[PDB]
Amino acid sequence: TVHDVIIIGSGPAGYTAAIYAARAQLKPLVFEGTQFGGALMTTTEVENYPGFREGITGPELMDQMREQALRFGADLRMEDVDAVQLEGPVKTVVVGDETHQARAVILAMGAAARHLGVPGEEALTGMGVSTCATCDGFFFRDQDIVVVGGGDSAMEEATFLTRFARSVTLIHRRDEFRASKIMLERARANEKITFLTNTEITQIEGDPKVTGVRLRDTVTGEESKLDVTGVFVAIGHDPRSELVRGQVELDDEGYVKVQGRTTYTSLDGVFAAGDLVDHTYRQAITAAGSGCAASIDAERWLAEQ
Amino acid sequence: TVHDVIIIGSGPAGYTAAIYAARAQLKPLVFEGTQFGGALMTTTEVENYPGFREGITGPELMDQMREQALRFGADLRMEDVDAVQLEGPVKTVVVGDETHQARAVILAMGAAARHLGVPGEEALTGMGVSTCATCDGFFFRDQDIVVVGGGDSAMEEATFLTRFARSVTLIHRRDEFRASKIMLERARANEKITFLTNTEITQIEGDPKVTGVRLRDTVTGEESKLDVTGVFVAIGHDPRSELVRGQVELDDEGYVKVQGRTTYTSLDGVFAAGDLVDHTYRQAITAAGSGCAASIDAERWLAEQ
Numbered sequence: 001t002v003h004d005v006i007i008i009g010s011g012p013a014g015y016t017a018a019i020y021a022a023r024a025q026l027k028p029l030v031f032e033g034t035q036f037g038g039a040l041m042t043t044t045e046v047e048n049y050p051g052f053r054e055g056i057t058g059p060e061l062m063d064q065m066r067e068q069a070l071r072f073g074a075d076l077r078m079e080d081v082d083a084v085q086l087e088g089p090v091k092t093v094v095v096g097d098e099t100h101q102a103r104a105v106i107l108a109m110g111a112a113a114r115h116l117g118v119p120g121e122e123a124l125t126g127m128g129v130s131t132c133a134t135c136d137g138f139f140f141r142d143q144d145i146v147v148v149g150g151g152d153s154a155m156e157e158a159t160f161l162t163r164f165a166r167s168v169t170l171i172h173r174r175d176e177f178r179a180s181k182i183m184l185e186r187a188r189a190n191e192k193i194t195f196l197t198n199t200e201i202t203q204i205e206g207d208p209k210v211t212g213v214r215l216r217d218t219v220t221g222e223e224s225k226l227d228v229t230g231v232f233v234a235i236g237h238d239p240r241s242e243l244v245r246g247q248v249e250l251d252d253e254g255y256v257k258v259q260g261r262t263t264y265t266s267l268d269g270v271f272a273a274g275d276l277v278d279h280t281y282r283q284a285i286t287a288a289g290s291g292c293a294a295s296i297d298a299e300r301w302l303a304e305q
Numbered sequence: 306t307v308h309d310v311i312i313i314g315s316g317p318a319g320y321t322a323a324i325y326a327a328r329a330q331l332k333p334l335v336f337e338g339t340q341f342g343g344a345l346m347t348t349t350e351v352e353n354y355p356g357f358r359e360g361i362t363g364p365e366l367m368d369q370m371r372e373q374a375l376r377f378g379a380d381l382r383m384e385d386v387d388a389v390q391l392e393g394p395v396k397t398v399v400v401g402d403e404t405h406q407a408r409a410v411i412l413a414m415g416a417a418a419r420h421l422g423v424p425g426e427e428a429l430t431g432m433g434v435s436t437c438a439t440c441d442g443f444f445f446r447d448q449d450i451v452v453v454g455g456g457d458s459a460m461e462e463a464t465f466l467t468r469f470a471r472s473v474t475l476i477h478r479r480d481e482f483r484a485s486k487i488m489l490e491r492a493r494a495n496e497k498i499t500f501l502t503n504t505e506i507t508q509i510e511g512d513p514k515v516t517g518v519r520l521r522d523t524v525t526g527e528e529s530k531l532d533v534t535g536v537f538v539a540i541g542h543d544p545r546s547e548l549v550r551g552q553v554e555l556d557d558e559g560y561v562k563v564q565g566r567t568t569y570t571s572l573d574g575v576f577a578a579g580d581l582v583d584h585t586y587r588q589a590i591t592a593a594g595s596g597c598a599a600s601i602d603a604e605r606w607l608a609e610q
């Protein structure tokens with residue numbers, strides 16, 4: 001059995017691709033992962049996804065997406081793809097000890113937001129801990145919050161957040177910043193931002209919601225506690241391109257490269273969508289749009305064969 | 306009063322831009338038009354917009370979008386922009402006898418699908434008359450339908466539709482096709498497609514739904530009726546770039562050009578989203594994604610000023 005298309009991933013990109021591919025009668029085979037449903041499965045309210053005047057929880061939205069794909073005939077498998085062979089007319093994916101083949105493959109594996117890896121970070125996610133100022137910054141009006149990170153990301157998150165927060169404490173483990181000079185001086189100029197260099201978070205405290213962070217000086221080991229009600233983690237993003245490295249061309253940070261304003265990768269018959277590709281917008285709606293484009297690309301490419 | 310941003314247009318691009326801009330506290334001023342709500346306001350069921358497992362009508366979806374934008378503080382005006390001055394630090398839009406100014410402008414004016422302009426075409430829209438095989442082709446399984454047009458669009462629509470339709474009659478007013486050779490021969494090879502050259506539709510018949518088309522030979526004037534239950538119009542798209550022609554760079558078909566994979570146009574402070582830009586995918590979800598990108602571009606550009 002060689003399927004028309006296999007989709008790898010189950011966030012907004014993968015499900016929107018599945019919906020279009022299934023409605024186009026391509027009978028898409030979709031490997032969702034055991035941690036299925038993408039990044040929104042790990043948040044609370046999604047308010048900026050257009051179509052929901054009163055908002056919707058992340059898992060609610062993602063299950064609508066999933067049931068929609070099922071209704072049009074997508075074959076969904078809650079399993080991880082462990083290896084792929086993407087070159088040539090017949091592509092193979094390996095899932096444990098099982099193999100599946102297709103003429104076209106849509107890569108929708110997303111990007112992981114780097115975690116601090118400290119106690120309290122996972123439990124207080126959506127309860128004071130966030131990875132996205134555009135997404136959740138709204139909810140921290142007149143509060144004291146922290147932003148963790150030393151790059152342009154952290155700089156942009158911290159400066160953006162000062163239009164809501166009472167104060168923003170920007171925490172970085174070194175005394176040097178990898179942020180561009182312009183981004184670093186914008187934050188320095190902002191009166192609502194205080195810099196804590198040579199500082200790491202060791203724990204996030206909070207009884208149902210974030211109430212404070214425990215800090216450590218990375219040079220002296222001095223520790224203290226900071227009273228805050230928000231923690232924005234901006235220590236970077238890792239595109240999940242490990243499966244396809246050495247097969248599809250990646251950029252220097254691991255993102256899958258695509259041709260022009262399409263989803264075509266460097267390999268014939270292989271298309272890529274979502275935050276696996278986009279290091280600029282990183283929203284559910286942009287990921288959803290690009291998964292629709294990937295499926296239209298694939299259908300058009302399949303018709304050419 | 307100089308606003309931070311003005312949005313021109315009220316389809317999925319404009320409303321998604323409004324939602325993001327309003328949630329970012331930019332207080333966007335949005336000119337929706339008197340024919341507000343974009344192309345979906347003129348369809349029935351929207352089934353491929355991810356997030357709705359049982360589908361949603363076009364006007365239902367668009368009003369969710371509109372109320373969502375209002376809830377975050379967008380200032381919506383149901384009025385046409387009649388002229389713009391987009392160059393320089395302060396941009397102006399003219400609405401009848403009123404003027405409004407902003408530091409940033411997001412162009413979201415969409416594209417008009419060319420109409421046949423015949424009796425019955427508007428009344429039977431969403432009732433047998435369609436402009437989008439990807440959108441509505443699903444609903445014509447085992448029926449006899451027509452596709453009107455002579456380009457790659459019509460070719461692609463006609464060939465795609467044969468996976469649903471019993472038969473597809475492809476109607477064109479000349480005996481020559483502007484479609485590329487590959488697209489024209491794909492349709493010629495398809496056994497479910499019959500070509501009617503030198504033929505125009507003069508009227509679409511239908512008591513609540515399409516039941517037939519009246520035809521005329523454009524050379525001899527011979528007329529006849531064809532029994533069909535679907536009419537797909539694929540005579541082209543016209544981007545609504547008339548406002549900005551001579552100010553923003555357009556491509557040879559009138560679409561607004563943007564830089565790379567962003568929404569930046571050729572003019573500082575001017576961004577463009579949706580089907581005004583995209584001549585490739587033309588879906589609500591892709592338009593919605595690109596209006597989110599336009600607002601993120603604008604916010605980042607405003608912060609740089």
Ligand SMILES: Cc1cc2nc3c(=O)[nH]c(=O)nc-3n(C[C@H](O)[C@H](O)[C@H](O)COP(=O)(O)OP(=O)(O)OC[C@H]3O[C@@H](n4cnc5c(N)ncnc54)[C@H](O)[C@@H]3O)c2cc1C
Nearest residue numbers: 009010011013032033038039081110274275282283284287
């Ligand atoms: C906490 C949080 C809150 C957010 N809130 C918002 C918000 O309110 N609004 C908004 O617009 N955006 C929000 N985002 C961002 C948004 O969720 C992402 O931009 C979007 O989900 C990206 O979609 P994607 O499909 O490219 O990838 P992802 O969402 O990462 O989905 C990819 C999926 O594919 C699976 N997958 C990966 N590799 C494999 C494999 N080998 N085999 C099988 N499956 C695999 C993954 O496990 C994952 O389930 C939030 C993100 C986070 C982390």
Ligand SMILES: Cc1cc2nc3c(=O)[nH]c(=O)nc-3n(C[C@H](O)[C@H](O)[C@H](O)COP(=O)(O)OP(=O)(O)OC[C@H]3O[C@@H](n4cnc5c(N)ncnc54)[C@H](O)[C@@H]3O)c2cc1C
Nearest residue numbers: 314315316318337338343344386415579580587588589592
């Ligand atoms: C009949 C039909 C059915 C469709 N069905 C589907 C479907 O099921 N699924 C799908 O994904 N897509 C569907 N589409 C396509 C989808 O609607 C479009 O791709 C999408 O709406 C494009 O959004 P946009 O915001 O770029 O522009 P548009 O939707 O065209 O919206 C632009 C809006 O801005 C307004 N505007 C323009 N100029 C001005 C001005 N000067 N001043 C003020 N306002 C102005 C316009 O009047 C319009 O209301 C359908 C299209 C049609 C025509």
Ligand SMILES: O=C(Cn1cccn1)Nc1ccc(O)cc1
Nearest residue numbers: 114115116117148173199200201
């Ligand atoms: O950097 C990490 C973990 N990591 C994940 C991938 C690579 N590193 N954590 C961290 C924790 C507290 C802090 O203040 C700064 C950073």
Ligand SMILES: O=C(Cn1cccn1)Nc1ccc(O)cc1
Nearest residue numbers: 419420421422453478504505506
């Ligand atoms: O071309 C048009 C109208 N038009 C709109 C913009 C430019 N032309 N109509 C048409 C009607 C029947 C037919 O068979 C083919 C075409």
Ligand SMILES: [Mg+2]
Nearest residue numbers: 035037038039
């Ligand atoms: Mg996930």
Ligand SMILES: [Mg+2]
Nearest residue numbers: 340342343344
């Ligand atoms: Mg309209």
